[PDB]
Coordinates of C-alpha atoms in Angstrom, one line a residue:
Chain A
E3 CA -18.2 19.2 -25.8
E4 CA -16.5 16.0 -24.4
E5 CA -13.1 16.6 -25.9
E6 CA -13.4 19.9 -24.0
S7 CA -14.0 18.6 -20.5
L8 CA -11.6 15.8 -20.7
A9 CA -8.8 18.2 -21.5
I10 CA -9.9 20.2 -18.4
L11 CA -9.7 17.0 -16.3
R12 CA -6.3 16.2 -17.8
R13 CA -5.4 19.7 -16.6
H14 CA -6.6 18.9 -13.1
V15 CA -4.6 15.7 -12.8
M16 CA -1.5 17.4 -14.2
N17 CA -1.9 20.2 -11.5
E18 CA -2.3 17.8 -8.6
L19 CA 0.7 15.9 -10.0
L20 CA 2.9 19.0 -10.0
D21 CA 1.5 20.5 -6.7
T22 CA 1.9 17.3 -4.7
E23 CA 5.3 16.8 -6.3
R24 CA 6.6 20.3 -5.2
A25 CA 5.1 19.7 -1.7
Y26 CA 6.8 16.2 -1.6
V27 CA 10.1 17.8 -2.4
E28 CA 9.6 20.6 0.1
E29 CA 8.6 18.2 2.9
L30 CA 11.6 16.0 2.4
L31 CA 14.0 18.9 2.4
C32 CA 12.2 20.2 5.5
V33 CA 13.1 17.0 7.4
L34 CA 16.6 16.6 5.9
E35 CA 17.5 20.0 7.4
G36 CA 15.2 20.4 10.4
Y37 CA 16.1 17.0 11.8
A38 CA 18.8 15.1 10.0
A39 CA 21.2 18.0 9.6
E40 CA 20.4 19.2 13.1
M41 CA 21.9 16.0 14.4
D42 CA 25.3 17.4 13.5
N43 CA 24.6 20.8 14.9
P44 CA 26.7 21.6 18.0
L45 CA 24.0 23.8 19.5
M46 CA 21.9 20.6 19.7
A47 CA 24.5 18.1 20.7
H48 CA 23.4 18.4 24.3
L49 CA 20.0 16.9 23.4
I50 CA 21.4 13.9 21.5
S51 CA 23.5 10.9 22.5
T52 CA 26.3 9.5 20.4
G53 CA 24.4 6.3 19.7
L54 CA 21.4 7.9 18.1
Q55 CA 23.7 10.2 16.1
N56 CA 25.3 7.2 14.5
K57 CA 22.0 5.6 13.7
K58 CA 21.1 8.6 11.5
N59 CA 21.3 6.4 8.4
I60 CA 19.0 3.8 9.9
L61 CA 16.5 6.5 10.8
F62 CA 16.5 8.3 7.4
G63 CA 17.5 5.6 5.1
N64 CA 18.3 7.0 1.7
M65 CA 15.8 9.9 1.9
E66 CA 18.5 12.3 0.7
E67 CA 19.2 10.2 -2.4
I68 CA 15.5 10.3 -3.1
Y69 CA 15.2 14.0 -2.5
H70 CA 18.0 14.8 -5.0
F71 CA 16.3 12.7 -7.6
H72 CA 13.0 14.5 -7.4
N73 CA 14.5 18.0 -6.8
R74 CA 17.2 17.8 -9.5
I75 CA 15.4 15.6 -12.0
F76 CA 11.8 14.5 -11.8
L77 CA 10.1 17.7 -10.7
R78 CA 11.9 19.5 -13.5
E79 CA 10.7 16.9 -16.1
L80 CA 7.1 16.9 -14.9
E81 CA 7.0 20.6 -15.4
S82 CA 8.1 20.3 -18.9
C83 CA 4.8 18.5 -19.5
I84 CA 2.6 21.3 -18.2
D85 CA 1.8 22.0 -21.8
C86 CA 1.1 18.5 -23.0
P87 CA -0.3 16.6 -19.9
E88 CA -1.0 13.4 -21.8
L89 CA 2.8 13.1 -22.3
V90 CA 3.7 12.9 -18.7
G91 CA 3.7 9.1 -19.2
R92 CA 7.1 9.5 -21.0
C93 CA 8.7 11.1 -17.9
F94 CA 8.2 8.0 -15.8
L95 CA 9.2 5.8 -18.7
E96 CA 12.5 7.6 -19.1
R97 CA 13.2 7.3 -15.3
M98 CA 12.0 3.8 -14.4
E99 CA 15.5 3.0 -13.4
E100 CA 15.9 6.0 -11.1
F101 CA 12.8 4.8 -9.2
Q102 CA 14.7 1.7 -8.1
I103 CA 16.0 3.8 -5.2
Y104 CA 12.6 3.3 -3.5
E105 CA 13.3 -0.3 -2.9
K106 CA 16.2 0.5 -0.6
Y107 CA 14.0 3.0 1.3
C108 CA 11.1 0.6 1.8
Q109 CA 13.3 -2.3 2.9
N110 CA 15.0 -0.1 5.5
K111 CA 11.8 1.4 6.7
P112 CA 11.0 -1.3 9.2
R113 CA 14.5 -0.9 10.6
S114 CA 13.8 2.9 11.0
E115 CA 10.4 2.1 12.5
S116 CA 12.0 0.0 15.2
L117 CA 14.6 2.7 16.0
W118 CA 12.0 5.4 16.1
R119 CA 10.1 3.4 18.7
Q120 CA 13.1 3.5 21.0
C121 CA 14.2 7.1 20.4
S122 CA 11.0 9.1 19.7
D123 CA 10.7 10.4 23.3
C124 CA 14.3 11.7 22.9
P125 CA 14.6 15.5 23.7
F126 CA 16.2 16.2 20.3
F127 CA 13.1 15.5 18.2
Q128 CA 10.7 17.4 20.5
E129 CA 13.0 20.3 20.0
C130 CA 13.4 20.1 16.2
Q131 CA 9.6 19.8 15.9
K132 CA 9.1 22.9 18.0
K133 CA 11.6 24.9 15.8
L134 CA 10.0 23.7 12.6
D135 CA 6.6 24.5 14.1
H136 CA 5.1 21.1 13.0
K137 CA 1.9 19.7 14.5
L138 CA 3.3 16.3 13.3
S139 CA 6.3 14.3 14.4
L140 CA 9.2 13.0 12.3
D141 CA 7.4 9.7 11.9
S142 CA 4.7 11.2 9.7
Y143 CA 7.5 12.6 7.4
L144 CA 9.6 9.5 7.3
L145 CA 6.6 7.6 5.6
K146 CA 6.3 10.1 2.8
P147 CA 8.6 8.4 0.3
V148 CA 6.5 5.3 0.8
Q149 CA 3.2 7.2 0.5
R150 CA 4.4 9.1 -2.6
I151 CA 5.7 6.1 -4.6
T152 CA 2.2 4.6 -3.9
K153 CA 0.3 7.5 -5.4
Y154 CA 1.9 7.7 -8.8
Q155 CA -0.2 4.8 -10.2
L156 CA -3.3 6.4 -9.0
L157 CA -2.3 9.7 -10.7
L158 CA -1.2 7.9 -14.0
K159 CA -4.5 5.9 -13.9
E160 CA -6.4 9.2 -13.6
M161 CA -4.5 10.7 -16.5
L162 CA -5.1 7.6 -18.6
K163 CA -8.8 7.8 -18.0
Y164 CA -8.9 11.3 -19.4
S165 CA -6.6 10.5 -22.4
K166 CA -8.2 7.5 -24.2
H167 CA -8.1 9.5 -27.4
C168 CA -4.8 11.4 -27.0
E169 CA -1.5 10.9 -28.8
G170 CA -0.1 9.6 -25.5
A171 CA -2.6 7.1 -24.3
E172 CA -0.2 4.2 -25.0
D173 CA 2.8 5.7 -23.2
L174 CA 0.5 6.4 -20.2
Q175 CA -0.7 2.8 -20.0
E176 CA 3.0 1.6 -20.3
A177 CA 4.1 4.1 -17.6
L178 CA 1.2 2.9 -15.4
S179 CA 2.3 -0.7 -15.8
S180 CA 5.9 0.2 -15.2
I181 CA 5.1 1.8 -11.9
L182 CA 2.7 -1.0 -10.9
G183 CA 5.6 -3.3 -11.7
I184 CA 8.1 -1.4 -9.5
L185 CA 5.6 -1.4 -6.7
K186 CA 5.1 -5.1 -6.9
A187 CA 8.8 -5.8 -7.1
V188 CA 9.4 -3.6 -4.0
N189 CA 6.5 -5.3 -2.1
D190 CA 7.8 -8.7 -3.1
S191 CA 11.3 -7.9 -1.9
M192 CA 9.9 -7.0 1.5
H193 CA 8.8 -10.6 2.0
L194 CA 12.1 -11.9 0.6
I195 CA 14.3 -10.1 3.2
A196 CA 12.1 -11.8 5.9
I197 CA 13.1 -15.3 4.9
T198 CA 15.2 -17.0 7.6
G199 CA 17.5 -20.0 7.6
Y200 CA 18.5 -19.9 4.0
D201 CA 21.6 -22.0 3.4
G202 CA 23.3 -19.8 0.8
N203 CA 22.9 -16.6 -1.2
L204 CA 19.5 -15.6 -2.5
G205 CA 21.0 -13.3 -5.1
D206 CA 22.2 -16.0 -7.4
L207 CA 18.7 -17.5 -7.5
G208 CA 17.9 -15.0 -10.2
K209 CA 15.2 -12.4 -10.0
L210 CA 12.3 -12.8 -7.6
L211 CA 9.1 -13.1 -9.7
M212 CA 6.3 -14.0 -7.3
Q213 CA 5.7 -14.7 -3.7
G214 CA 2.5 -15.6 -1.8
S215 CA 1.0 -17.9 0.9
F216 CA -0.9 -21.0 -0.3
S217 CA -2.4 -24.2 1.1
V218 CA -0.2 -26.9 -0.4
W219 CA -1.0 -30.6 -0.9
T220 CA 1.5 -33.2 -2.0
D221 CA 1.1 -36.2 -4.2
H222 CA 4.6 -37.6 -4.5
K223 CA 5.4 -41.1 -5.9
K224 CA 7.3 -42.9 -3.2
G225 CA 9.8 -42.6 -0.3
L232 CA 3.0 -36.0 4.5
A233 CA 0.5 -33.3 3.4
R234 CA -1.7 -35.7 1.3
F235 CA -5.0 -34.7 2.9
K236 CA -4.4 -31.9 5.4
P237 CA -2.7 -29.2 3.4
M238 CA 0.4 -27.4 4.7
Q239 CA 0.7 -23.6 4.8
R240 CA 3.7 -22.4 2.9
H241 CA 4.9 -19.1 1.5
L242 CA 6.4 -19.5 -1.9
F243 CA 9.0 -17.4 -3.7
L244 CA 9.3 -17.9 -7.4
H245 CA 12.8 -17.2 -8.6
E246 CA 14.3 -17.6 -12.1
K247 CA 16.5 -20.4 -10.8
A248 CA 14.1 -22.0 -8.2
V249 CA 10.9 -22.0 -6.2
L250 CA 11.4 -21.7 -2.4
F251 CA 9.0 -23.1 0.1
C252 CA 8.9 -21.4 3.5
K253 CA 6.9 -21.8 6.6
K254 CA 5.4 -18.6 8.0
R255 CA 6.9 -18.0 11.5
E256 CA 4.9 -15.7 13.7
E257 CA 6.9 -12.9 15.3
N258 CA 5.8 -10.7 18.2
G259 CA 6.6 -7.1 18.9
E260 CA 5.2 -3.6 18.6
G261 CA 4.5 -2.7 15.0
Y262 CA 6.1 -4.1 11.8
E263 CA 7.8 -6.4 14.2
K264 CA 4.5 -8.2 14.3
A265 CA 5.0 -9.1 10.6
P266 CA 6.0 -12.7 10.3
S267 CA 9.3 -14.1 9.1
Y268 CA 9.7 -17.0 6.7
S269 CA 11.6 -20.2 7.8
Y270 CA 13.2 -21.7 4.7
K271 CA 12.1 -25.3 4.2
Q272 CA 12.7 -26.7 0.8
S273 CA 13.7 -25.5 -2.7
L274 CA 12.8 -26.8 -6.2
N275 CA 15.4 -26.1 -8.9
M276 CA 13.6 -24.7 -12.0
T277 CA 15.5 -26.9 -14.4
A278 CA 13.6 -29.9 -13.1
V279 CA 10.2 -28.1 -12.4
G280 CA 7.2 -28.9 -14.5
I281 CA 3.7 -27.5 -14.3
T282 CA 0.1 -28.7 -14.5
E283 CA -2.3 -25.9 -15.3
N284 CA -5.6 -27.7 -15.0
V285 CA -6.6 -29.9 -12.1
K286 CA -9.8 -31.9 -11.9
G287 CA -12.4 -30.4 -9.6
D288 CA -10.8 -27.0 -8.8
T289 CA -10.1 -24.3 -11.3
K290 CA -8.1 -22.5 -8.6
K291 CA -5.6 -25.3 -8.2
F292 CA -2.4 -25.8 -10.2
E293 CA 0.4 -28.2 -9.7
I294 CA 4.1 -27.5 -9.4
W295 CA 5.8 -30.8 -9.8
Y296 CA 9.5 -31.9 -9.7
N297 CA 11.7 -34.5 -11.4
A298 CA 9.6 -36.2 -14.0
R299 CA 6.6 -35.7 -11.6
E300 CA 7.9 -37.9 -8.9
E301 CA 7.2 -35.1 -6.5
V302 CA 3.9 -33.2 -6.9
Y303 CA 2.7 -30.0 -5.1
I304 CA -0.8 -28.9 -5.5
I305 CA -1.2 -25.2 -4.9
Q306 CA -4.4 -23.7 -3.8
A307 CA -4.6 -20.3 -5.4
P308 CA -6.9 -17.9 -3.6
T309 CA -8.2 -16.4 -6.8
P310 CA -8.1 -17.0 -10.6
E311 CA -6.0 -13.9 -11.1
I312 CA -3.3 -15.2 -8.8
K313 CA -3.3 -18.7 -10.3
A314 CA -2.9 -17.1 -13.8
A315 CA -0.1 -14.9 -12.7
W316 CA 1.8 -17.8 -11.2
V317 CA 1.1 -20.1 -14.1
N318 CA 2.2 -17.4 -16.5
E319 CA 5.4 -16.6 -14.6
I320 CA 6.4 -20.3 -14.3
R321 CA 5.8 -20.8 -18.1
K322 CA 7.9 -17.8 -19.0
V323 CA 10.8 -19.2 -17.0
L324 CA 10.3 -22.7 -18.4
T325 CA 10.2 -21.2 -21.9
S326 CA 13.5 -19.3 -21.4
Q327 CA 15.2 -22.4 -20.0
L328 CA 14.2 -24.1 -23.2
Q329 CA 15.6 -21.4 -25.5
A330 CA 18.8 -21.5 -23.3
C331 CA 19.2 -25.3 -23.2
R332 CA 20.1 -25.1 -26.9
Chain B
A5 CA -4.0 20.1 23.0
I6 CA -4.6 16.3 22.8
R7 CA -3.0 14.6 19.8
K8 CA -4.6 11.5 18.2
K9 CA -3.8 9.4 15.1
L10 CA -6.5 8.3 12.8
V11 CA -5.7 5.8 10.0
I12 CA -8.5 5.1 7.5
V13 CA -8.4 1.6 5.9
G14 CA -10.3 -0.4 3.3
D15 CA -10.7 -1.2 -0.4
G16 CA -9.6 1.3 -3.0
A17 CA -12.4 3.2 -4.7
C18 CA -14.6 2.8 -1.6
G19 CA -14.4 6.5 -0.9
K20 CA -11.5 6.8 1.6
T21 CA -9.7 9.8 0.2
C22 CA -12.9 11.6 -0.6
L23 CA -14.3 11.2 2.9
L24 CA -11.1 12.8 4.3
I25 CA -11.3 15.6 1.7
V26 CA -14.9 16.4 2.6
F27 CA -14.3 16.3 6.4
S28 CA -11.0 18.3 6.5
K29 CA -12.4 20.9 4.1
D30 CA -16.1 20.6 4.8
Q31 CA -17.1 20.7 1.1
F32 CA -17.4 18.0 -1.6
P33 CA -15.3 18.7 -4.7
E34 CA -17.5 19.1 -7.7
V35 CA -15.3 19.1 -10.9
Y36 CA -12.2 17.0 -9.9
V37 CA -11.9 14.8 -6.9
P38 CA -8.3 14.9 -5.6
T39 CA -6.3 11.6 -5.6
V40 CA -3.7 12.7 -3.1
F41 CA -4.4 13.4 0.6
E42 CA -1.2 13.8 2.5
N43 CA -1.0 13.5 6.3
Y44 CA -3.2 16.4 7.7
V45 CA -4.0 17.4 11.3
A46 CA -7.6 18.5 11.8
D47 CA -8.9 20.5 14.8
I48 CA -12.0 18.8 16.2
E49 CA -13.6 19.2 19.6
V50 CA -15.7 16.5 21.4
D51 CA -16.9 16.3 25.0
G52 CA -15.5 19.8 25.5
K53 CA -12.0 18.6 24.8
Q54 CA -9.8 20.1 22.1
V55 CA -8.2 17.4 19.9
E56 CA -5.6 17.5 17.1
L57 CA -6.6 14.6 14.9
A58 CA -3.9 13.5 12.6
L59 CA -5.5 12.0 9.4
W60 CA -3.5 9.4 7.5
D61 CA -4.8 8.3 4.1
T62 CA -4.0 4.8 2.8
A63 CA -5.3 5.2 -0.7
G64 CA -2.9 3.6 -3.2
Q65 CA -1.5 1.0 -1.0
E66 CA -4.3 -1.5 -0.7
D67 CA -2.5 -4.0 -2.9
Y68 CA 0.8 -4.1 -0.9
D69 CA 0.6 -6.2 2.2
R70 CA 4.2 -5.4 3.3
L71 CA 4.0 -1.6 2.7
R72 CA 0.5 -1.3 4.2
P73 CA 1.6 -2.0 7.9
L74 CA 4.1 0.8 7.7
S75 CA 1.2 3.1 8.5
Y76 CA -0.2 1.3 11.5
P77 CA 2.4 2.3 14.2
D78 CA 0.8 4.2 17.1
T79 CA -2.7 4.5 15.7
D80 CA -5.3 5.7 18.2
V81 CA -8.4 4.9 16.1
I82 CA -9.0 3.1 12.8
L83 CA -11.7 4.1 10.3
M84 CA -12.3 0.9 8.5
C85 CA -14.7 1.4 5.6
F86 CA -16.5 -0.1 2.6
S87 CA -18.7 1.4 -0.2
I88 CA -22.5 1.2 0.2
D89 CA -22.8 0.5 -3.5
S90 CA -20.3 -2.4 -3.4
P91 CA -21.2 -5.6 -1.4
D92 CA -17.8 -6.7 -2.5
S93 CA -15.9 -4.1 -0.5
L94 CA -17.9 -5.1 2.5
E95 CA -16.9 -8.8 2.2
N96 CA -13.3 -7.7 2.6
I97 CA -14.0 -6.0 5.9
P98 CA -14.0 -9.4 7.7
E99 CA -12.0 -11.4 5.1
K100 CA -9.1 -8.9 4.7
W101 CA -9.0 -5.7 6.6
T102 CA -10.2 -6.7 10.1
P103 CA -7.7 -9.6 10.6
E104 CA -4.9 -7.2 9.6
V105 CA -6.0 -4.2 11.5
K106 CA -6.4 -6.4 14.6
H107 CA -2.9 -7.9 14.3
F108 CA -1.0 -4.7 13.9
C109 CA -3.3 -2.5 16.0
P110 CA -4.5 -4.8 18.8
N111 CA -7.1 -3.2 21.1
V112 CA -7.3 -0.1 18.9
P113 CA -11.0 1.0 18.4
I114 CA -12.5 0.4 15.0
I115 CA -15.3 2.5 13.4
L116 CA -16.9 0.6 10.6
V117 CA -18.1 3.0 7.9
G118 CA -20.4 2.8 4.9
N119 CA -19.4 5.4 2.3
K120 CA -21.6 6.7 -0.5
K121 CA -24.9 6.0 1.2
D122 CA -26.6 8.3 -1.3
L123 CA -26.0 5.7 -4.0
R124 CA -28.2 3.2 -2.2
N125 CA -31.4 4.8 -3.6
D126 CA -29.6 5.7 -6.9
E127 CA -31.3 3.7 -9.7
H128 CA -28.2 3.8 -11.9
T129 CA -26.0 1.9 -9.4
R130 CA -29.0 -0.4 -8.6
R131 CA -29.1 -1.3 -12.3
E132 CA -25.3 -1.9 -12.8
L133 CA -25.3 -4.0 -9.6
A134 CA -28.2 -6.1 -10.8
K135 CA -26.2 -7.1 -13.8
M136 CA -23.5 -8.5 -11.5
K137 CA -26.3 -10.2 -9.5
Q138 CA -26.0 -7.7 -6.7
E139 CA -27.8 -4.9 -4.9
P140 CA -26.7 -2.0 -2.6
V141 CA -25.7 -2.8 1.0
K142 CA -28.6 -2.6 3.4
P143 CA -28.1 -0.8 6.8
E144 CA -29.0 -4.1 8.5
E145 CA -26.0 -5.7 6.8
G146 CA -23.7 -2.9 8.1
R147 CA -24.6 -3.1 11.7
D148 CA -24.3 -6.9 11.6
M149 CA -20.8 -6.7 10.1
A150 CA -20.0 -3.9 12.6
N151 CA -20.8 -6.2 15.5
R152 CA -19.4 -9.3 13.8
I153 CA -15.9 -7.7 13.7
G154 CA -16.5 -6.1 17.0
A155 CA -16.4 -2.4 15.9
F156 CA -16.8 0.5 18.3
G157 CA -19.8 1.4 16.2
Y158 CA -21.3 1.4 12.7
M159 CA -21.9 4.5 10.6
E160 CA -22.9 5.7 7.2
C161 CA -22.3 9.0 5.3
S162 CA -22.2 10.6 1.9
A163 CA -19.3 12.7 0.6
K164 CA -21.6 14.4 -1.9
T165 CA -24.2 15.6 0.6
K166 CA -21.6 15.7 3.5
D167 CA -24.4 13.8 5.3
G168 CA -22.9 11.9 8.2
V169 CA -19.3 13.0 7.5
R170 CA -18.9 15.2 10.6
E171 CA -20.6 12.4 12.6
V172 CA -18.0 9.8 11.6
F173 CA -14.9 11.7 12.7
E174 CA -16.7 13.0 15.8
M175 CA -17.5 9.4 16.8
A176 CA -14.0 8.2 16.0
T177 CA -12.3 11.0 18.0
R178 CA -14.4 9.9 20.9
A179 CA -13.3 6.3 20.6
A180 CA -9.7 7.5 20.4
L181 CA -10.0 9.4 23.7
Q182 CA -11.0 6.2 25.5

C-alpha cells in the first residue's frame, strides 16, 4: 500500500541522515587531530613555522566548537528518532540556536581560504595527509561544515515529502523553514562583512533582513539616476536601508568576490514604500521623507519584490506599534 | 598518480548528485536516491594516464551566492549541467552559472551537460511541460548553448540507463589534463 512505501522512504531518509551525520562527525575529528592537534606536536615542529602555528585559528575557524555540538548533542538526538523518523523535525527545532555557530564558521572561511592558498605547499600538511592516508587535502575537509549545513534542508525536505500524513508533518515544515532561515541569514551576513567605508557601527542598525543587487532609478523632488539606473547593493536593516556600490576586487578565489562601498543610508523612521508602479510589476519604490526622495527598485523577479516589500512593511508595522 | 578536481554546478533538481552517484558507483539507485554526496575521489583512466578525480557536489547550495564560491578554489574542470526536461534550468546556464563559473574559475574548462535525456521521449514529462507551455530540450539547443558559453564540449546522459554517464566524466577528465 502507499502508507507502506512512504514509511519505507521515511526510513531511507532517516538512515542517510544518521549515516552522513556520523561520517560528518568522524571526518571533523579526523582533521582536528590529524592536522590541528599535530600542529602542537613536537615531532612535527620541524615541518611547521611559528607563523603558521599561530594562524591555526584562522585555518580551522571554530571547527572544534562545531564538532562538539554534533558529537555531544545533535547526533545523540537524531538517534533518538530512529524509531519515529517523522519527529526528527523536533530535533532541529530544539537546537536552532546551537546552529548559529555556523555563521562564525562561514564568515571566517574566506580568511582560511586565503591562508590555505599561501600555506598549502607547506611540508607539514603533505606529511599529515600521508599519515592519515587521505587521497584528499585538508582543503576538502575544511569545507565540510559549509557543505553539511547546506544539506539539512535537502534532507528535511525529503522527510517532509514522505510525511504529509504523519503526526509530525507540521514540525518538519517548521524545521525546514528554520534551517532555510539560518542559511539565508548566514548568506546575508557574508555580504554584510564585505561592506567598506561605513562611518559607524553596523551592529546598532538592528538585524540584517535582506540584501541584494538592483538597478535603481531616482525621482527626487528638488536639490542623477533619473534615466540611466545606477547599480547598488542594498542591505535592509531594522533601523535603515544601506545603499552600496559593488566594488570589483581581484585575486585568486573568494578574493574575486566584490566588496561593497558604502554610499548612502535611509533611516527607516522616515522610509515609506510604494508597492505598485505603473508599467512594471517587478518595480517597487522605497521613498524617503514625505516622498521628497524616491528610489525605484528593479526587482529581478516577483518573489524578490515580494520578499522585500514584505520585510519593509513588517518593519514599518513595528515602528508604528512602537511609536505609541 | 595525477590528481584533478571536478566541481559539478547547476540548478538544483537538475540531476547533479544523481549523476555523481551513478558514475562513482556505476549503478542507478532504484528505491531511494541519496541526497548527500560527500567529496569522493574516483579512479579513472584516459589516454593511458591514471587519474584520481576528486568529485565535489554542490547540491544544496544553489541559493547561496556567497557560500557557493567557497567550492571553486583550484578547480581543474567544471561539469556545468541542466535537466533535459527543464528548458528553465538551461536558461540559467548562460544567465547564472556561466558568468559565475567564469569569474571564479577563469580559463577552467567547462563541460556542458544535459541530464535525464531519457525523459525527452517520456510522454509524461512532455505532457506536464506542455501545461507550462514548454517542451523537452532538443539536442540542437544543447550544442548551441555549449558553444554560446564556450564550453569544452556538449554532452547528454541518463542516470537511469547509465547511458552517457561514463562518457561525461571521461571527457571532463581529458579537459582537465589539458
